[PDB]
Amino acid sequence: TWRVYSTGSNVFQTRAGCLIGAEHVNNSYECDIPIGAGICASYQTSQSIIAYTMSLGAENSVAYSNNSIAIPTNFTISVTTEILP
Amino acid sequence: VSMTKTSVDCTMYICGDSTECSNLLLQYGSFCTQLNRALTGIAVEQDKNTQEVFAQVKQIYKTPPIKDFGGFNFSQILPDPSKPSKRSFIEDLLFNKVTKFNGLTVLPPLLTDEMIAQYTSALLAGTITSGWTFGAGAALQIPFAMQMAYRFNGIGVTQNVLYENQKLIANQFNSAIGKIQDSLSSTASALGKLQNVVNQNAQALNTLVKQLSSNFGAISSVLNDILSRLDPPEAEVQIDRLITGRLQSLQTYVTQQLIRAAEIRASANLAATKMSECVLGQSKRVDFCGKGYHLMSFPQSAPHGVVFLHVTY
Amino acid sequence: IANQFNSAIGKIQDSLSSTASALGKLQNVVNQNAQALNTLVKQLSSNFGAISSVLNDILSRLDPPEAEVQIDRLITGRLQSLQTYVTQQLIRAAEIRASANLAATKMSECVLGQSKRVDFCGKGYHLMSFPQSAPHGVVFLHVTYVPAQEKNFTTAPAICHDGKAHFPREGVFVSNGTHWFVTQRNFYEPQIITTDNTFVSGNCDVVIGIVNNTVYDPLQPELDS
């Protein structure tokens, strides 16, 4: 019976359906709330829910030649944690 | 690796938009709640299986513009930027070999086909350029003619065999990839493991629809037929035979889906283990990354699965 | 190394005391068993097509010709609630069986020894792992070796000095622009090229990319003295 969110000017058409009450941007961030088909949702700043395309990480190209090598000079020691029932 | 997702309405499958049927469904307890809770945990778990296998690294690498790999031709596994679908040539052949309104629906997956192929192109650029160092720390550049000198030493072969026979191993490597393009395109029975997932899940959906024509000892199989011919003193007896008949059909579909969801979960953990022991490094286990002495592996994309490519000695 | 190891366990003590989101796998085990037992005791209030939901309500009001009809709708409705609870607990026991065998495999490989498998006992080159206790679970602390700082160099696959090709025994060749050295692949230690670090095999007219350099002989100052 609720039709308070059908005012308009926020409608964006996705592949899983349509998302109303949220704005669409053109940037790409790491999302936490999944929607479907790559579209995500978050809370970014006077703050509103935005929707964007899920990114896959920062770009990092590497050099490659016939006479190029990379040897490390220093190291760190790190301790992680794993929990299994 | 994964399985397609589904969602079954509890009230729409039993009661055909009728209020007289839904008044008797509330006396059976929380049977409509447990069916939606079990199908929710399956659809979440199918999205987790594609993250432990493909999303192993969080740094998207890229192919260098100069293709100087020392006589090795990787022109069949690298993606094509001119095509609208960013896939390789072997990934295009693997896609063409695999093939309602009663409350049932199919939810789309989160990770689409273009984001899976970018994971494969990032892991292919790390194995060729960096090698076995992009999985333990940062990426270190090693030439491809010097990468196999360490891979030969891991199986007990000195580096004099590789360097003095560079024109023979590079000719056998390019001739081996070209044999896969003739073996897959001719015989279509090699992808029978992926077609057994979409066929056994389609038989369970057609069984729920064809079971709506049963009577279960009632007069007819239409809910509008019994409410139009009999009186509500007597109409509730025939609805009781149709609710209990359709409730055992929904408990059968969820229980058979929960057993099949454990074997795909058991197969996704095996694919996540081979994506780090055979691809991200050189393994010494016999009959794990192929028959013989394993050297390197290359991953490929597939619908509802993964396809490996081992290189042995 | 001992200063980085003692400062690494201190970063686990503040992460485990600030938030409780790290134990999310153990929280879903207790919450699923508490939700299955709560739903089973809530189905005793249903009717399942009978006249009442209390067995004393039907027995103290109706006649034994009729009392066998309404009780039959209650035994049938309550037996299906137990068959669903037992079957769901039998599938959940298969998930905890796969996690118990994985915890026993990492106890014998990562804890009691050292594994050479990539991304099994931690991210990186595994060195040590200490087990800890947990309610209905186990917690591992993987000590790993990760390189941090890098530096580019110019390499070569082999060298030849007087017609005979020289291959490196353990490591690769590097060059800072003037001289050539032999270093390892995980740490940078420049050493001079000698006969104890090389391996002679054939001539240098076959290997592609070979450069010209000199190999030091350790028998030069001792035989002249």
Numbering used by the authors:
A (entry chain A): 632 to 676, 689 to 728
B (entry chain B): 729 to 827, 854 to 1067
C (entry chain A): 923 to 1147
Paper text:
The spike (S) protein of SARS-CoV-2 is a glycoprotein that forms trimers protruding from the virion surface and mediates viral entry into cells. Here we present cryo-EM structures revealing two conformational states of Delta spike and S/ACE2 complex in four states.
The two cryo-EM maps, including a one RBD-up open conformation (termed Delta S-open) and a transition state (termed Delta S-transition), were obtained at 3.1- and 3.4-Å-resolution, respectively. There is no linoleic acid (termed LA) in the Delta S-open and S-transition maps, as in our recent Kappa and Beta S structures, obtained in the same construction and purification condition. In addition, in our Delta S-transition structure, the three protomers appear asymmetric, and the 630 loops and FPs are partially or fully disordered, which is usually the case in the transition or open state of WT/G641/Delta spike. Collectively, these features suggest that the S-transition is not in the closed state, instead, it may represent an open initiation transition state with its RBD-1 in the initial stage of lifting up.
